[PDB]
């Protein structure tokens, strides 16, 4: 309606083909007209992530530890990671002919071409890393449900949640290299799991890490097993 | 079949999803079984470029000035530019567990990933440059046929072929910002077309360049109007 009018002034409207979510921006959302204008430029911003929407883009001010940002690094592929100013400056321009904006002026820092291009690979970061099944303490910040959803988007097949305190060796699943992989928060957890596994499956390989180990692996789309950062314990 | 036999030895074969052409390589072609193998890896190598095959990949030993290479820069997008060894090494492994090969070990030397990502844009390079209709001399090496279709793949709408030397102003087309854009071969052509356009359409803008001006624009997926390299004459 009012949008057709605004856009009618334009001749060669680009189709950007962006199927995006946003994080840490656009907190006011968009009015009906801006959504229609965007649609015309082939831009849609989805409120939630759905596999069927074939998302290929994230808007964010910077690298953020959010569920959406982390998952965006599992898009197939991730086409662009852009600052919200791209949308803001484009709309302001249209609201005043032709659109001249350089999409490449708005790339998020630290999300470089080498990383983005890893999303074109046939594998996910944890599949490449041979971490198929993982154990996750249930006391983990953010809630076990969101952590697991992120880890599964990034190639982990089985997320086993361990009851804090209550658990025994039988509750632990192996990884089908490290036979046992655990994500913990407390150093008393590290000792408890080391004892338990050496008692019940002695001489088996173990990797115990904290959440930041995964997060950093995602941010780089590579697990560097030679690194000692965020590794709490390992037996190989 | 026999390829299945060969690959059945493998669990979790990758799906590279490559729709490729090759240039400067695979000159012996592939046998029936290697093609079925590649097929199972999600790799197909087409003999020619067809818009509807939605190609996303080129195999080449290095950056080449072939029609196939130049056009691969107009893929939507170009996902990988890879050395032929990628295919050779992997088929070698296969004919002899699983496939252990790193796609990124085979990136073509001297390709800028930031350049390849411009293929993700909604526009082509000459469309961005507002070079829509050009004039091309007929003695241009490689022939007008191939130069013409390379330019069209990269956003130029009309290619007007000029007969030198029996040539008049009426044989020239304007670019519908430079009103007249000419690709020439010889210094005497530069002088001729300047004289002619100034006489018949005085005080109009003119850009006269060498073929290499277009080739380098394509290699960088950018026409840099600030550079004078490969420019023979301009009046702005």
Domain boundaries, chain B: 1-122, 123-236
The two three-digit tokens of residue B103, written as one number: 């796609």
Q: What single DSSP character describes residue A106?
A: G
Measured between alpha carbons, how far is B207 from B185 in angstroms, rounded to an integer?
Answer: 14
The two three-digit tokens of residue A3, written as one number: 């949008």
Instruction: Say whether residue B28 is in contact with chain A using an 8 A CB cutoff.
Output: no
Q: Do A122 and B15 touch (CB under 8 A)?
A: yes
Per the CB < 8 A criterion, the answer to whether A9 and A37 are in contact is no
- Residue of B61, B224, B69 whose CA lies nearest to B146: B69
Peptide bond into A77 cis (omega under 30): yes
Distance between first and last Cα of chain B: 65
- Residue of B7, B211, B191, B4 whose CA lies nearest to B94: B7
- Residue of B80, B82, B103, B94 whose CA lies nearest to B26: B82
Provide the b/e sequence for A214-229 (b: ≥16 CB within 10 Å).
Answer: bebbbbebebebeeee
The two three-digit tokens of residue A229, written as one number: 């950062």
* Cα torsion A137, A143, A144, A149: sign: negative
Q: Do A14 and B79 touch (CB under 8 A)?
A: no
**Fold agreement between A1-122 and A123-236:** yes
* PDB experimental method: X-ray
- Domain range A123-236, CATH architecture: 3-Layer(aba) Sandwich (3.40)
Residue with tokens 């004459």: B233
User: Which residues in chain B touch residue A113, judged by CB atoms under 8 angstroms apart?
Assistant: 113-114, 117
For B8, what's the count of Cα atoms within 13 Å in the CB-facing half-sphere?
6
Instruction: Say whether residue A187 is in contact with chain B using an 8 A CB cutoff.
Output: no
Give resolution, Å, one decimal: 2.3
Query: Which CATH homologous superfamily contains domain B1-122?
Result: BRCT domain (3.40.50.10190)
Distance between first and last Cα of chain A: 65
Q: What single DSSP character describes residue B165?
A: S
The two three-digit tokens of residue B185, written as one number: 């071969």
B189 class by beta-carbon count within 10 Å (0-12 exposed, 13-18 middle, 19+ buried) = buried
User: Which residues in chain B touch residue A106, judged by CB atoms under 8 angstroms apart?
Assistant: none
């Amino acid at each position: 309606t009012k949008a057709e009018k605004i856009l009618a002034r334009f001749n060669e409207l680009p189709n950007y083909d962006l199927k995006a979510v946003c994080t840490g921006c656009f907190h006011d959302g968009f009015n009906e007209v801006d959504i229609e204008i965007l649609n015309q430029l082939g831009i849609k911003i989805f409120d939630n992530i759905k596999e069927t929407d074939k998302l290929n883009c994230i808007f964010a001010p910077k690298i953020l530890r959010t569920e959406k940002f982390l998952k965006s690094l599992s898009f197939e592929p991730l086409k662009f990671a852009l600052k919200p100013e791209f949308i803001i400056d484009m709309l302001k321009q249209i609201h005043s002919s032709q659109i001249n904006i350089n999409l490449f002026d708005y790339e998020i820092n630290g999300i470089n071409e080498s990383i983005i291009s890893k999303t074109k690979l046939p594998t996910k970061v944890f599949e490449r890393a041979n971490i198929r099944c993982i154990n996750l303490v249930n006391d983990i910040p953010g809630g076990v449900d969101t952590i697991g959803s992120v880890l599964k988007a990034h190639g982990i097949e089985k997320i086993n949640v361990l009851r804090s305190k209550k658990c025994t060796f039988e509750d632990i699943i192996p990884n089908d290299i490290f036979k046992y992989v655990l994500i913990v928060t407390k150093a008393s957890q590290v000792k408890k799991f080391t004892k338990m596994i050496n008692d019940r499956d002695k001489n088996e390989t173990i990797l115990i890490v904290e959440w930041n180990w995964c997060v950093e692996s995602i941010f780089h789309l590579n697990v560097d097993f030679t690194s000692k950062k965020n590794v709490l314990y390992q037996k190989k």
